[PDB]
Design a protein around this ligand. Structure first.
Ligand SMILES: Cc1ccc2c(c1)sc1nncn12
Ligand SMILES: [Cl-]
Length: 166
């Protein structure tokens, strides 16, 4: 109920650091990563896994989960670490979209913040979502997606926080 959280800084030698950095670097290699943090929020995580289990029981062969990017300002980081994206919310397939200064506002020290988020994209359509008993998310392009919009609580887990600069 409280959704208390811990913030674990990944050592550069932690396998997960290389894994998160490689995905970011598909489109953001020109930026300098200062740190990557794991957000540990047992209540938020349990709530997210509850919704994943329901969606996994519903959508047959659908791979319901994707790992997507979300840019935030520095000030929102404690809010997202506690609440996730519960309010819909825009998630990018590529980091360079989230890395735009409008979505990852540089702070007073030039530092930018993008989460690498577990998102239950489930079954989606072009765009609360419409009928079909609704779609799980809407996307810009059903066959070549670059962004997803989630409207439901506990549909996203802010697993990793990337702090970086120009
Ligand atoms: C239209 C739109 C709105 C928000 C948004 C994107 C695209 S890509 C991204 N990454 N974090 C936030 N966002
Ligand atoms: Cl914090």
């Amino acid at each position: 109920k409280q959704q208390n959280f811990c913030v674990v800084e990944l050592l550069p030698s932690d396998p997960e650091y290389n894994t998160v950095a490689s995905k970011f670097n598909q489109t953001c290699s020109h930026f300098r990563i200062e740190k990557i943090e794991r957000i540990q929020n047992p209540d938020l995580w349990n709530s997210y896994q509850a919704k994943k289990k329901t969606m996994d029981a519903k959508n047959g062969q659908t791979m319901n989960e994707k790992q997507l990017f979300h840019g935030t300002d520095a000030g929102s980081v404690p809010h997202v670490n506690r609440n996730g994206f519960n309010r819909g919310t825009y998630f990018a397939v590529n980091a360079n979209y989230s890395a735009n200064d409008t979505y990852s506002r540089p702070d007073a020290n030039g530092r930018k913040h993008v989460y690498y988020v577990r998102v239950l994209t489930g079954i989606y359509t072009h765009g609360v979502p419409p009928s079909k008993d609704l779609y799980d998310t809407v996307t810009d392009n059903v066959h070549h997606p670059s962004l997803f919009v989630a409207f439901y609580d506990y549909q996203a887990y802010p697993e990793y926080l990337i702090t970086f600069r120009k």
